[PDB]
Amino acid sequence: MGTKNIGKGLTFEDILLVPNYSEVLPREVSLETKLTKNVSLKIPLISSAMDTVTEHLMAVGMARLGGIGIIHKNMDMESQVNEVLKVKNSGGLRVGAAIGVNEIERAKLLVEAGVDVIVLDSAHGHSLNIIRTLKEIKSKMNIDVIVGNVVTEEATKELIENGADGIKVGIGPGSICTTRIVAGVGVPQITAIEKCSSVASKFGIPIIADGGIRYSGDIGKALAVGASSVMIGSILAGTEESPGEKELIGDTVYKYYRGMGSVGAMKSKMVPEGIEGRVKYKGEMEGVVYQLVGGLRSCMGYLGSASIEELWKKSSYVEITTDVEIV
Amino acid sequence: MGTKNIGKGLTFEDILLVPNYSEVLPREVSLETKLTKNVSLKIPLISSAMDTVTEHLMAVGMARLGGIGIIHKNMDMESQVNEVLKVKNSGGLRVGAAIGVNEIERAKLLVEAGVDVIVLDSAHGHSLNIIRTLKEIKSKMNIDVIVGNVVTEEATKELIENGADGIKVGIGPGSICTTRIVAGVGVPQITAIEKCSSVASKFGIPIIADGGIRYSGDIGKALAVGASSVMIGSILAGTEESPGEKELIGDTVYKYYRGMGSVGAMKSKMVPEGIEGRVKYKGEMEGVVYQLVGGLRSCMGYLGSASIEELWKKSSYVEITTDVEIV
Amino acid sequence: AMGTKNIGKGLTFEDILLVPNYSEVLPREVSLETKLTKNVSLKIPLISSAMDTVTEHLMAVGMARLGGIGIIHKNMDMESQVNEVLKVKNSGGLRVGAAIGVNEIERAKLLVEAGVDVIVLDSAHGHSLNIIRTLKEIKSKMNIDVIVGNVVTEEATKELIENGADGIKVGIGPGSICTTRIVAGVGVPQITAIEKCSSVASKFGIPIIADGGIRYSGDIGKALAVGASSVMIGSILAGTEESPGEKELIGDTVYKYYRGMGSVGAMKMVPEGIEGRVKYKGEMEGVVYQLVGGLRSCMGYLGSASIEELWKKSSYVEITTDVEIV
Amino acid sequence: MGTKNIGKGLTFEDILLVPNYSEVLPREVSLETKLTKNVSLKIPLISSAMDTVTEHLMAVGMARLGGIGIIHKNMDMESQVNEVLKVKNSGGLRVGAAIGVNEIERAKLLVEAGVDVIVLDSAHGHSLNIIRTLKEIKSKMNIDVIVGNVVTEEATKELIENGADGIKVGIGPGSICTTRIVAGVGVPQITAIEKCSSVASKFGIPIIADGGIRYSGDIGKALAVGASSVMIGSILAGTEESPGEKELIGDTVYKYYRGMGSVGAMKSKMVPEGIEGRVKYKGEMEGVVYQLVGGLRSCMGYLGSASIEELWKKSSYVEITTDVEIV
Ligand SMILES: C/C(=N\OCCN)c1cccc(C(C)(C)NC(=O)Nc2ccc(Cl)c([N+](=O)[O-])c2)c1
Ligand SMILES: C/C(=N\OCCN)c1cccc(C(C)(C)NC(=O)Nc2ccc(Cl)c([N+](=O)[O-])c2)c1
Ligand SMILES: C/C(=N\OCCN)c1cccc(C(C)(C)NC(=O)Nc2ccc(Cl)c([N+](=O)[O-])c2)c1
Ligand SMILES: C/C(=N\OCCN)c1cccc(C(C)(C)NC(=O)Nc2ccc(Cl)c([N+](=O)[O-])c2)c1
Ligand SMILES: O=c1[nH]cnc2c1ncn2[C@@H]1O[C@H](COP(=O)(O)O)[C@@H](O)[C@H]1O
Ligand SMILES: O=c1[nH]cnc2c1ncn2[C@@H]1O[C@H](COP(=O)(O)O)[C@@H](O)[C@H]1O
Ligand SMILES: O=c1[nH]cnc2c1ncn2[C@@H]1O[C@H](COP(=O)(O)O)[C@@H](O)[C@H]1O
Ligand SMILES: O=c1[nH]cnc2c1ncn2[C@@H]1O[C@H](COP(=O)(O)O)[C@@H](O)[C@H]1O
């Protein structure tokens, strides 16, 4: 009854994947995927380009486990290049790096330093400035470019037309995100993946599902509705390999975790669109990633899918509504 | 299922605005709007006509920042006139003043005092007494009259036909409102703005979205579905410029904030339709208004809208369902 | 809706809001006169519940004086119930009701002889053989208006009316102290239940009593708006001084006992009500004043000068379900 | 709005049963039911095959009250056989026993020991391994086999065609279940029973509703939408007859209750799909079961159903939205 009402948006919590006939065990499924149309991964996990999540140590950790880390850009170009070189000089290991609009010089140095992918990011990926930066990169240098963040078919189509090698989806869903309350803007993440994958898959362009992952189950849901990989922040921020500081709040140890659109991140008249928060310290990332990969394998076993491509073809979900004390 | 069921009603929390292709930056958008058909504002913010929110200092503050304040009527005619004169005597600043049903004498004195707009208020705007008062004002004096509060198409049409220069929308959504629980009456504010805007827009008559604003994001939502401006109470009640008293509750400083239909406000056999509450002290209104305006600019940027006219044209929304500890 | 046994969405009071109409009537001007049964009228549409923590003679005298009516509960010997009814009648000839259960023909007889104005035939499941038999037997042996409940369906409403019901009490599920939903898994949301039952009863001119679930004055307006002629109230009145419930100090607050008639204590088993406590509210007149005031406000918003007009003009909208009150 | 969306899933809390005309009292209803196509029970209650719920003492209690207990498999074959023999030597009492995939030797020993039903269970019942194990059992020995857990029509149909004598439904609903959050997989239990019973009732094959029972009212709901019986874990875990350990926490006594997919159960590199929890100690199981049976009787009385078969015929439900302090 609303003219401007385009429908009901679903987030991860709104749905559950329905089991299929299965002939494959969790241990047997292949988790190989495409990061961009020219770069592959062994597992579909990416660490977020945030200054409390990913520098060289996190990037090295991610790559060793078959994923990839995106070096954040909240540092001068020289330091970012050096972080990339740190990962690259640690054996033949893939690594990514973030840039912002009009940062062509930063992009050039990164590419020279041997980065495998450039992540061109903005709060609003479907914009004139972003597209102009994209076209400039593709014409000046030889590199795969992931562009984001977008949530619509139209955005996805236009970015692909201008040379996007990967599409990053997510406005609204981040754990430290306040765009939804500051600007009133967003799209629930399942719906956003569905819309963007509906265009991108037609062109063989990978969708990165960015933000809102809380449990391993969410990874399965994101991939099932069309994503090729997921980008993760808060979960990895609590690990020993994250660059964030530590603080003892009362009894337990916490790691700092802040949005790149927070007051503190922007200092490194403002209208912040992210908070500065704390997450519980969780130790080594390897144990953390193992559980995440373990959960996804279990999911794909339930859906009888031996690969992500198969999962796209076989998956379906149900909408759900939203006395034992756990030890 | 019920014949009397007119459908599902949405409030601000129920929806999220969808991003469009954008070639305008937040800093570049124009927030100019019409308060009434003959009075314009530089920003679409109005402070509520309540005795804990708007007297002359709040009204001056709002006017200086491009908005307007409505002097409340919980005082003798002479006192209300003097408050208006205080705003008027400090630069050529705009100001409004509230009156109730049959208060023709008060309105006359306010108009003579140079008030820019009269706000004819009632719990139930769509009524015989309100219409009569409106017609009497329009025939005895020359001034723009805003009439409210209403939530239906029929109400909006009738008030416009009888000469209303602006329509104030909102029954149910105010933070201190108990009409919904005392009378069981109301309409969720997004739905109410849509219904009323569907009639008023072709007439070129501005809709004021009154009540329920908690975050800057809500302002964007209100304007996007048809409103020309928003009226705000509780957010401004906490500022140093509001007339409410201060109380120290344990650790933090609070300001009094009460509905004009509360027992205490009606004392200044009763059946109250508002509560007497407290809100945290927030300091200078300038910083508060800065954030609100900033959030709206962010919104219009996401929606590629360089003006409010453009926002009405381009906006769409999605209906939504309703680990990190903030520092 | 995907399930073959799914008959649709059920709405309770909290699920909806009444939409304002054009109004030419003030809250003070509306008439609250209504029918209790097709032969008994009331000045206000409020009934106090037939529970042993809510209504004995003092509550029933309170209700009647204010324009409503009280239903004396049946958790007492027959002679005792008659004496309560006689206490109400001895003071101004005020109207009063009384509850009976299935097969309690002797009790109904004594009550009618005592001058009761209406008999309330009550069961957990009103649409049953035993209830129908008792109803038919009453109508044939004595001359009295009989309210029957509780029911939630069109077919229940129709059959009870065809067997002589003078009023229909609607409510399975909504009571504040009710656990039928949890114990039996049974019930219908109260807005939907009133709509279904009134759709049948309005054709025969038989009043609907909306029983249970009232928390705020606004709920009264909603119930009447969708077809009810009156509402029955328990927990709100249970905290008043006129209620027969005991009082207990818990912490720094005085509480009144309030228990379901299907609770262990009331029956003294598979209980379908809880034993609870409600905050003490003082005299009932002030409480009833607020309730009536809120309903007047509602009828003013909906431009309805009477309950009849409210039935004709009312519509509602479905809704989704940092100012700190002093 | 989503193509892979198969609809809204309902759990127990989402519905309420609608009363029918009744000519039967709660005390008059028959609770007799089929456990499998060749085994009948006096009441439709089964205790879960978990090591904190059912060993011989629980199984004897369930049998004497008219139901049945399923001896868990987290013990050696000889120990499980010994538990079965303990129940059989306590008079002619029904008893069941659980096996996993490929546990043909275990099944043979249990059958030779006089077990009345084999419960072939897996996290994902609709799989190649489960089907092969089923066909192997049916071909090598003579016993009724209950197979689970499944949530779909296709799964139900295939297991039945391959010789299942009972179908256990439930992926998602258990009180200690985290398959939902670890794998992102599940189906709300009312919907799951509906889908599976739509197939199984055509073949006269009983549906067991497994998991998520919290109140007696839930049993009525499960049977009403097509189940022949319900399996219960958490409710019975707190009884004196459960094998769980006891522990004082504060001033209240708790019993241990853990998923069989918990790390604690699998110890008796893990990716658990159940939690380790505690439930309040509730004394003898007899009083507990009495309330559940009484609740179901009350339900069938409301629905005018003198038997479960009649309940299937007459039942309907409504979908619902989801100041008195209890003593
Ligand atoms: C929200 C955000 N990042 O989010 C990542 C995707 N969820 C973020 C990161 C750093 C700074 C900021 C800040 C600077 C706080 N805010 C924005 O940039 N907001 C914004 C609003 C509308 C538009 Cl159209 C544009 N734009 O680039 O043209 C930007 C935000
Ligand atoms: C609720 C309210 N204001 O709300 C502002 C808009 N949300 C308010 C303010 C002062 C006094 C009151 C009081 C006096 C407490 N309440 C009403 O006036 N209620 C009301 C109900 C229905 C009608 Cl039909 C009429 N009417 O005069 O025609 C009035 C309420
Ligand atoms: C639930 C209830 N009253 O509710 C009033 C309306 N909500 C109540 C009052 C006293 C005792 C009880 C008790 C005795 C606790 N429970 C029932 O009577 N339950 C019940 C269930 C199904 C049927 Cl079919 C019948 N029946 O008489 O035919 C009765 C309940
Ligand atoms: C979840 C569960 N039981 O649930 C009972 C019914 N809800 C459970 C019990 C013991 C171990 C486990 C463990 C071992 C923790 N997890 C699984 O077995 N998970 C799983 C995932 C997908 C598949 Cl395709 C299969 N499989 O049948 O090969 C198994 C889980
Ligand atoms: O300040 C911000 N505001 C909104 N989103 C942000 C901000 N900073 C980072 N993000 C996004 O949030 C994601 C992480 O989401 P999380 O894993 O749910 O913590 C990142 O990959 C970014 O896309
Ligand atoms: O007592 C009352 N009851 C209901 N609404 C009120 C009352 N007093 C003021 N209002 C409305 O509530 C608005 C403020 O809502 P808020 O900004 O959400 O606090 C005012 O502009 C009035 O329209
Ligand atoms: O024990 C019980 N179980 C269920 N309903 C009850 C029980 N006792 C009283 N009731 C109902 O609950 C109504 C009161 O509801 P309340 O006003 O919401 O407290 C009564 O008028 C009865 O219809
Ligand atoms: O570890 C587990 N993960 C998920 N489900 C489990 C696990 N262990 C047992 N279950 C299921 O949960 C049921 C008990 O559900 P409850 O009665 O709601 O506690 C059992 O009968 C099993 O079907």
Residue numbers in the entry:
A (entry chain A), B (entry chain D), D (entry chain B): 1 to 92, 135 to 310, 325 to 378, 388 to 392
C (entry chain C): 0 to 92, 135 to 309, 326 to 378, 388 to 392
Sentences from the paper on this structure:
Adenosine is converted into guanine nucleotides in a process that requires IMP dehydrogenase (IMPDH) activity. IMPDH is a homotetramer with square-planar symmetry. The reduced cofactor dissociates from the enzyme and the mobile active-site flap (residues 302–330) folds into the cofactor site, positioning the catalytic Arg315 to activate water for the hydrolysis of E-XMP* to yield the product xanthosine 5′-monophosphate (XMP).
P131 contains two aromatic groups, one of which interacts with the hypoxanthine ring of IMP, while the second interacts with the aromatic ring of a tyrosine in the adjacent subunit. The electron density indicates that Cys219 has oxidized to the sulfenic acid, as often occurs with reactive cysteine residues. In subunits A, C and D, the NO2 group is roughly parallel to the aromatic ring and forms water-mediated hydrogen bonds to Ser22 O′, Val24 O′, Ser164 OG, His166 O, Ser169 O and Asn171 N and ND2.
